[PDB]
């Protein structure tokens, strides 16, 4: 679950209004971001994004991926890597490693997710706005239970 | 700018695929997310997010909402709460003033942005999941340069 996988064995999921995205199952282990980009376009980047709540506290969560040409990123939902505890309309990081896990214990077990692209740039380094349409496409999909079996 | 504005003077931003907003000008000072909730829901927050780049460094910034209610929130432009650099695909905080004033006018100069709810939560404090479907509508809009002419 790092290298991507075949046609058969893909469960993609569909995506919403603010750019979610949502499956039929639970994530798991790991997610797979598949993107064509433009072909004016040198540089992407972005994130996969979630909330969730621990006894009282708000944390927002993201895992981040980057690309220079058409690919599919595999992203470990083990290994996130900005996280923040959101009180009021003000952030604090979060280096706390025994919260950390029990924020991806429970990430683990959503069936939906949230894609952002952040910031693109074409072949001339000059700057793509709106990052968005940088790409023809992109999606997300996570192992069928086939292909998890292994 | 704060206080919420009239519908003739309000110019709404167009909504796109991954959550985008588009106006026809630049944006300026000040920014309002209008939130109509679901009548079960107790908790709403979100951002508006930014990316800019400066000679080789790129940074990623938002700015934070929150509501229990439906209204309207003002967002001032030049006060963001989270700002960092992304370095590969990894993160770093930014606290180095004069480097955040330099993203602020910069942003202050764009015409797109980034709408995102992140955390819902009902009447009985129960998790909304996802986030989004705990509103009936989301909009931003910006001062018309009538009510600009102002101050």
């Given at each position: 679950?790092?290298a991507?996988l075949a046609d058969?064995?893909?469960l ?7 750019g979610?995205?949502?499956?039929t199952k639970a ?7 598949e ?11 972005g ?5 969730e709540?621990?006894?009282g ?7 981040v991926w980057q690309?220079?040409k058409?690919?599919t990123?595999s992203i470990?939902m083990?290994?996130?890597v900005?996280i923040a ?25 959503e069936?939906?997710?949230?894609l952002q ?6 072949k ?5 706005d709106?990052?968005?349409s940088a790409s023809?496409?992109?999606e ?8 998890d079996?292994?």
């Open positions: 679950g790092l991507p058969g064995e893909k993609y999921g569909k995506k919403g209004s603010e979610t995205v949502t499956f994530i798991g282990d790991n997610a797979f971001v993107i064509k980009t433009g072909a004016d376009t040198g540089f992407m980047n994130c996969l994004g979630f909330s709540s621990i006894d506290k708000n944390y927002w969560v993201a895992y690309t220079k058409s690919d990123i470990d083990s290994s996130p900005q505890e959101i009180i009021g309309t003000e952030t604090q990081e979060v280096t706390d490693a025994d919260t950390i896990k029990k924020l991806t214990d429970k990430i683990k077990t069936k939906s997710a949230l692209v952040w910031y693109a740039s074409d001339t380094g000059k700057q793509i709106p990052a968005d023809e496409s992109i997300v999909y996570i192992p069928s239970a086939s292909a079996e292994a």
